[PDB]
Structure 1
Amino acid sequence: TIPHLAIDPFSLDFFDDPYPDQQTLRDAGPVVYLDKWNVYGVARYAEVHAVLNDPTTFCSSRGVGLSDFKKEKPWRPPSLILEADPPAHTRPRAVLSKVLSPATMKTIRDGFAAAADAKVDELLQRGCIDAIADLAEAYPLSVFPDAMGLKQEGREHLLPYAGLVFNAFGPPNELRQTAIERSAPHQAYVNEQCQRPNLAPGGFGACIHAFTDTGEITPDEAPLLVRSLLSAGLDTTVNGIGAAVYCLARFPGELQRLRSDPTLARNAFEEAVRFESPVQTVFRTTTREVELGGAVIGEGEKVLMFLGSANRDPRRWSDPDLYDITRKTSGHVGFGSGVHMCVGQLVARLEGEVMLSALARKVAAIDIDGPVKRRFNNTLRGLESLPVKLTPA
């Protein structure tokens, strides 16, 4: 009843160009079985959205990667938010929502925007730059560690640690096994920075620890919630901003529309999140036998959701393969959907908005002028190198 496919969605060939195989996965049926890894797959918008919005049936506490925490020990203690179901999920979620709230955004926006303007001005003096190392990485590194309250020393561990986290959701391929092999120094650094005395006053980490006396979390929960922000809070934004610059580089007409109305910056970034889907995949585990798209999935089965495919499903989107900065993007699943929908989305959107605003006001053209190199990760989609010439406005 359910089609079986041999496509490996974690192979380098798939990462290099996922779109034909994602169409094959969508068109095979609402639910497929991936023989390579013994998981169910859903690649259409409708079923991805339905799964994400039924956390009781499709749980997260058995892991949101291939590994089933009921079968294998996780490589690090489980996240108290990502790898938890209601009700254990609810109060940690509420604390991070208040830490990364509108009022926090109001406190950090002016500095985030100044840093974005400064970075674009600096890049314009160089002219020819690498929009990954020099922009998509450099800008979040210039604002997010400071907003966390991290000391300066050791920050070189942050991107390696996040690459490890996101590779570890994948199957036991070389990408994952090599990441785990190299992990010990990065885990050591990150775990130490999660302790209250190592987080500067006023930053996100100190705020998490300050929430430990309300009855929502206890002091022993705060280090792992800081760990959540150091896991998910940087590499995601690197690939989101890199996606937006890559889109503007490939669609000069959309750069020109953005220049003409810089208030499109926030939606131009949201559209880049839909179009590239820097977070490609999440898993769930069934807690019962369940009917989904006419297939009966047994209890205890891993289900793989193709967020990037859902975001390009023509059943849901008009001209899905077009980058359109005035698209109505509401409903895309690039930040997830439902109770686990990205709790950091306001930080992500703030960074993306102020960077695209700086580009809109200061840059007249973005021209690829060197070999583009992709960066391979089991969960994240993005580039290793994006050589561009920036022409000043």
Structure 2
Amino acid sequence: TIPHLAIDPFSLDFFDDPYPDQQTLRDAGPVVYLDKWNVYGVARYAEVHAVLNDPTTFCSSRGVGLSDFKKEKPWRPPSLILEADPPAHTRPRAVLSKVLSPATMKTIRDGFAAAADAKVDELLQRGCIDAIADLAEAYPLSVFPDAMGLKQEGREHLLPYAGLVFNAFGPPNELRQTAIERSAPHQAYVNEQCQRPNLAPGGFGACIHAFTDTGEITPDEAPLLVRSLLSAGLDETVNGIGAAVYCLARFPGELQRLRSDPTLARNAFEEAVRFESPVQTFFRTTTREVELGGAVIGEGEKVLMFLGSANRDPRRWSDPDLYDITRKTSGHVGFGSGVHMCVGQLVARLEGEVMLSALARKVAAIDIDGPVKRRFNNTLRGLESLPVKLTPA
């Protein structure tokens, strides 16, 4: 009934080029069994969307990594939002939704845009740069920690902690065990910055603590909710921006369209999120026997959702492996879908938009002029190094 596959979606071979294996997973059936890790897999858009939008049947409180929290201890205390189900999910989600709200974006937009324009100006003085370290990493690090309200000391822990979080969703392979092996100093820094005295006035962290007044969260809930914004956000946005630059370098016709109409910057970034899907996968756990695409899955089974694959499913997308900055991207699952859909998506889109805006207005050409190196992570897809020459407009 259900095809059994030996593909390891967390292998370095898979990470290096996942797209042929993703078609194999899609075309084998709507539901596959992955013998390597004893989980079910869904790689077509339809089933990924269906799983995401039934949180009662496909829960997150038993972990959204391979590990089942009913069988193993979580490597860190569970997230109050990502690793919770309704109704426990609802009030922390509402707090983060207000902290990162449409109205909040107005207070940070001008500074985020200024930093993006300034970074592109700086990179044009150098000409030949690494669009990962010097741009995709450098830009978010120049705006988001300040917007959190973090002190300057210790910020070198932020990228290692994010990489650890996303490796820890994976199976117990060497990527995950090595990350946890090295985790203690990053864990200690992050947990300490979550305390109210260490979050500067007016930033995201202080705003979370300010909500402990309303009855939506208690003061003892606020540190772990701050932890959510020190786990999420950085690595995905870095990878998304790097993907966008990569695409503009590989598809010069799309850079030319973007230069011709810089108001396409926001959709250019959204299309990069669909095309690269920085978050490749998330798990759910069944809370009952369930019929999914003609297959019967038992209770307490892990279901692996291939978000990147769903975003390139030709059953849903015209020319899915073309980067098209005018594509109607509404419906892509790069930010998830449903009750858990990325609560920080307005922050991610703002960073991506103002960076692609600066490039659209200031750069004439982006040419790869060095070896492209991939970055390997159990959950994230992104580049390690992207040597480009930037030609000023």
Shorter-normalised TM range: over 0.9
Q: Distance in 2 between matches of 1:330 and 1:233?
A: 21
SS in 2 for 1:279: coil
Partner of 2:283: 283
Q: CA deviation at 1:193?
A: 0.2
Residue-pair matches, total: 393
Q: CA deviation at 1:236?
A: 1.1
Q: Distance in 2 between matches of 1:362 and 1:258?
A: 11
Deviations along 1:92-122, one digit per CA (max 9) or x if unpaired, are 0000000000111000000000000000000
Partner of 2:362: 362
Q: Distance in 2 between matches of 1:283 and 1:177?
A: 19
Q: Distance in 2 between matches of 1:187 and 1:179?
A: 11
Q: CA deviation at 1:146?
A: 0.1
SS in 1 for 2:296: strand
Q: Distance in 2 between matches of 1:299 and 1:130?
A: 47
Q: CA deviation at 1:36?
A: 0.1
Q: Distance in 2 between matches of 1:9 and 1:388?
A: 30
Q: Distance in 1 between matches of 2:240 and 2:216?
A: 31
Q: CA deviation at 1:280?
A: 0.1
Q: Distance in 1 between matches of 2:194 and 2:236?
A: 19
Q: Distance in 2 between matches of 1:221 and 1:81?
A: 11
Q: Distance in 2 between matches of 1:253 and 1:220?
A: 52
Q: CA deviation at 1:233?
A: 1.6
Q: CA deviation at 1:39?
A: 0.2
Partner of 2:71: 71
SS in 2 for 1:285: strand
Q: Distance in 1 between matches of 2:358 and 2:29?
A: 43
Q: Distance in 2 between matches of 1:387 and 1:151?
A: 31
- In the TM superposition, 1:26-65 aligns within 5 A as 26-65=26-65
Deviations along 1:310-366, one digit per CA (max 9) or x if unpaired, are 000000000000000000000000000000000000000000000000000000000
Deviations along 1:13-48, one digit per CA (max 9) or x if unpaired, are 000000000000000000000000000000000000
Q: CA deviation at 1:137?
A: 0.2
SS in 1 for 2:175: helix
- In the TM superposition, 1:285-304 aligns within 5 A as 285-304=285-304
Q: Distance in 1 between matches of 2:339 and 2:41?
A: 21
Partner of 1:88: 88
- In the TM superposition, 1:318-333 aligns within 5 A as 318-333=318-333
Deviations along 1:46-93, one digit per CA (max 9) or x if unpaired, are 000000000000000000000000000000000000000000000000
SS in 1 for 2:366: strand
Q: Distance in 1 between matches of 2:81 and 2:236?
A: 17
Partner of 1:136: 136
Q: Distance in 2 between matches of 1:192 and 1:276?
A: 33
Provide the aligned C-alpha RMSD in A: 0.3
Q: Distance in 2 between matches of 1:14 and 1:110?
A: 40
SS in 2 for 1:268: helix
Q: Distance in 2 between matches of 1:103 and 1:268?
A: 23
SS in 1 for 2:209: helix
Q: Distance in 1 between matches of 2:147 and 2:238?
A: 16
Q: CA deviation at 1:306?
A: 0.1
Q: Distance in 2 between matches of 1:233 and 1:316?
A: 27
SS in 1 for 2:291: strand
Q: Distance in 2 between matches of 1:222 and 1:235?
A: 22
Q: CA deviation at 1:251?
A: 0.4
Deviations along 1:271-309, one digit per CA (max 9) or x if unpaired, are 000000000000000000000001100000000000000
Q: Distance in 2 between matches of 1:139 and 1:315?
A: 36
Q: CA deviation at 1:223?
A: 0.3
SS in 2 for 1:175: helix
Q: Distance in 2 between matches of 1:235 and 1:14?
A: 20
Q: Distance in 2 between matches of 1:43 and 1:377?
A: 19
Q: Distance in 2 between matches of 1:89 and 1:247?
A: 36
SS in 1 for 2:220: helix
Q: Distance in 2 between matches of 1:382 and 1:236?
A: 8
Q: Distance in 1 between matches of 2:41 and 2:236?
A: 23
Q: Distance in 2 between matches of 1:245 and 1:79?
A: 32
Q: Distance in 1 between matches of 2:266 and 2:137?
A: 19
Deviations along 1:177-199, one digit per CA (max 9) or x if unpaired, are 00000000000000000000000
Q: CA deviation at 1:3?
A: 0.1
Q: Distance in 2 between matches of 1:148 and 1:43?
A: 35
Q: Distance in 1 between matches of 2:290 and 2:198?
A: 46
TM-score (norm 2): 1.00
SS in 2 for 1:220: coil
Partner of 1:380: 380
